[PDB]
């Protein structure tokens, strides 16, 4: 019954305004880190370095396009092919330095650029799990303080990485910390705020991430060099670590632990901050106990064990994997469209704003399932048509990728509501975590799929498209939730 107490000590008041602003400010740089490698790893045009002894036309084989071939140089001077031992010359017009230029992650080692994104995301999957356990054991706040320090240290050390294995290690650790920031952000804010506003928070947090995409575009234009851009995007988290010491730990986590002494201390401190001091003094242990006694979940396995909840698990896992796998596939590949990588990031960021509305409108009106078939099928049709339409077309390809990314942003928003209303109260938090875990598996698998570009230039896109088209067909199986009350038991779910 914490909700009741939550409204005695000011409800939303100075403490919630101050702390929530501060706890959601870091998220503005989650987008900057997740998709940083579009700018820190951009691939400049590379052609082989002519042999040093020789004093480009004569030393470079030309492809059909008539541009110098990237991975080959002539063995002997041809007037009017060996792999390149002497290195590559990279165009410096757009990208002064990138991890690709620094470590020659080009030609045979091209897959390494994507391995690094996959490793960062392996870190994000690991961090959601490690830090989720650690938060329940050490506190939402203590785990946040340590996560701000880890992102700052790991990201700074990645910027000063001397070799590629080390950059990848510090990028996995950066992601582990960031996964814990994104989780503990929600928990600390949601638990210190009213229950009814469990979605507005899910929204401000959602839009604060989208604004992060414009932040990456503006920051990357200003600081093109990768070591400098990685340092700039990670140095803010040392400042976050310094003020995070003044956060107030969730009183709800304190009550759950068994320490009502700290629930009382937090509630009184907040009453001083919100200005309702008299009302806080009234709060004692005879009151807090009785009014928090009723409050005082099922194992994840159950999702698999019950046939009813296994069907809802499998179906939703395909929906969460597909949306993430496709979304990262599209968001990762900003260079191919033929427009500046900065304008495309700004555009891609913008779409999320009219998308989320159009989504809200179709979801609250038509249904929660028709919106998921439409958001995923249309994204799949757009991505597969980006694959088929010839590159020459930049506007037709850019417009279709932009619509597709907007549709996958809508799918993210719907799959959150859809997944919280489909599950019964007992397994609803486990189920939203498993769904988010499958989303993170999608992000790990997506860069690995992109490595198939070598096999065929359009194979990466044909998969990033076919998977959402298949997920859309899976939504047919799931049950409509519009106008139906949330289920409380498996039987309840079965009934409706
Ligand atoms: C909670 C898991 C989802 N994630 C992907 C897995 C790492 S995420 O990076 O947090 C993300 C991505 C995209 C959008 C959006 O466009 O709405 C919001 C959040």
Q: Where are the beta strands (DSSP E) in 324-378?
A: none
**Measuring CA to CA, how many Å separate 178 from each of 32, 124, 129, 172, 202?**
11, 7, 12, 10, 17
How many H-runs (helices) and E-runs (strands) does the chain carry?
22, 2
Q: Is 340 helix (H, G, I), strand (E, B) or coil?
A: coil
Taking the centre of ligand 1 as the mean of its atom positions, its distance from the CA of residue 173, in whole angstroms, is 18
- Please report, for residues 47, 236, 353, the alpha-carbon distance to residue 27 in angstroms, rounded to integers and kept in the order given: 39, 11, 17
Ordered domains of the chain (ranges, CATH) = 1-29+102-296 (1.20.1250.20), 302-496 (1.20.1250.20)
**Token pair 């340590």 is at which residue?**
146
Cβ < 6 A, ligand 1 pocket:
34, 124, 182, 206, 209, 324, 327, 352, 409, 412, 436, 439-440, 443
- β-bridge mates for residue 90, sequence order: 46
Residue whose CA is closest, atom 18 of ligand 1?
A: 206
Residue 17 makes CB contacts below 8 A (sequence gap 6+) with none
Q: Ligand 1 centre from 383 Cα, in Å?
A: 19
- What Cα–Cα distance (Å) separates residue 160 from each residue in 23, 226, 429? 28, 10, 39
Q: Which residues does 231 contact at the CB level (< 8 Å), separation at least 6?
A: 155, 156, 159, 160
**Atom of ligand 1 at shortest range from CA of 408:** 16
- Resolution, expressed in angstroms to one decimal: 3.2
Q: How many CB atoms lie within 10 A of CB 36?
A: 25
**DSSP per position, 162-196:** SSHHHHHHHHHHHHHHHHHHHHHHHHHHHHTS-SG
Helix H or strand E segment including 46: strand 46-48
Give CA separation, 47 vs 87, 91, 117, 249, in Å: 9, 9, 24, 55
Question: What's the start-to-end Cα distance of the chain, in Å?
Answer: 27
Distance 51 CA to ligand 1 centre (A): 46
Query: For residue 87, how far is its CA from the centre of ligand 1 (angstroms)?
Result: 38
């Amino acid at each position: 019954a914490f909700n009741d107490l939550l409204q005695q000590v000011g409800g939303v008041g100075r403490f919630q305004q101050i702390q929530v602003t501060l706890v959601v400010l870091p998220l503005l740089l989650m987008a900057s880190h997740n998709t940083l490698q579009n700018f820190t790893a951009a691939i400049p045009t590379h052609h082989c370095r002519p042999p040093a002894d020789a004093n480009l036309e004569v030393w470079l084989p030309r492809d059909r396009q008539g541009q110098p071939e990237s991975c080959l140089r002539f063995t002997s001077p041809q007037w009017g092919t060996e792999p390149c031992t002497d290195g590559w010359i990279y165009d410096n017009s757009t990208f002064p330095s990138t991890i690709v230029t620094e470590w020659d992650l080009v030609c045979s080692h091209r897959a390494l650029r994507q391995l690094a994104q996959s490793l960062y995301m392996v870190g994000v999957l690991l961090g959601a799990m490690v830090f989720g356990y650690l938060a329940d054991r050490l506190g939402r706040r203590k785990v946040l303080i340590l996560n701000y320090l880890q992102t700052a240290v790991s990201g700074t050390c990645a910027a000063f990485a001397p070799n590629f294995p080390i950059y990848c290690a510090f990028r996995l650790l950066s992601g582990m910390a960031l996964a814990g920031i994104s989780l503990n952000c929600m928990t600390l804010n949601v638990e210190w705020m009213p229950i009814h506003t469990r979605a507005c928070v899910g929204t401000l947090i959602g839009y604060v991430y989208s604004l992060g995409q414009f932040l990456l575009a503006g920051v990357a234009y200003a600081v093109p060099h990768w070591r400098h851009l990685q340092l700039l995007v990670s140095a803010p988290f040392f400042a976050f670590f310094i003020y995070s010491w003044f956060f107030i730990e969730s009183a709800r986590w304190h009550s759950s632990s068994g320490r009502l002494d700290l629930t009382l201390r937090a509630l009184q401190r907040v009453a001083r901050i919100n200005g309702k001091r008299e009302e806080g003094a009234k709060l004692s242990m005879e009151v807090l106990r009785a009014s928090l006694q009723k409050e005082l979940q099922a194992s994840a396995m159950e999702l698999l064990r019950c046939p009813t909840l296994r069907h809802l698990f499998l179906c939703l896992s395909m929906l969460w994997f597909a949306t993430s796998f496709a979304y990262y596939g599209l968001v990762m590949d900003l260079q191919g469209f033929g427009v500046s990588i900065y304008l495309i990031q700004v555009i891609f960021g913008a779409v999320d704003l009219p998308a989320k509305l159009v989504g809200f409108l179709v979801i609250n009106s038509l249904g929660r399932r028709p919106a998921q078939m439409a958001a995923l099928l249309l994204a799949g049709i757009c991505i597969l048509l980006n694959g088929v339409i010839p590159q020459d077309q930049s506007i037709v390809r850019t417009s279709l990728a932009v619509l597709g990314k907007g549709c996958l942003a809508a799918s993210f928003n719907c799959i959150f509501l859809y997944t919280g209303e489909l599950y019964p109260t007992m397994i609803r938090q486990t189920g939203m975590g498993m769904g988010s875990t499958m989303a993170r598996v999608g992000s790990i698998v997506s860069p690995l799929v992109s490595m198939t570009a070598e096999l065929y230039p359009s194979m990466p896109l044909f998969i990033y498209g076919a998977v959402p088209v298949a997920a859309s067909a899976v939504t047919v199986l799931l049950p409509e939730t519009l106008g139906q009350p949330l289920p409380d038991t498996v039987q309840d779910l079965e009934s409706r």
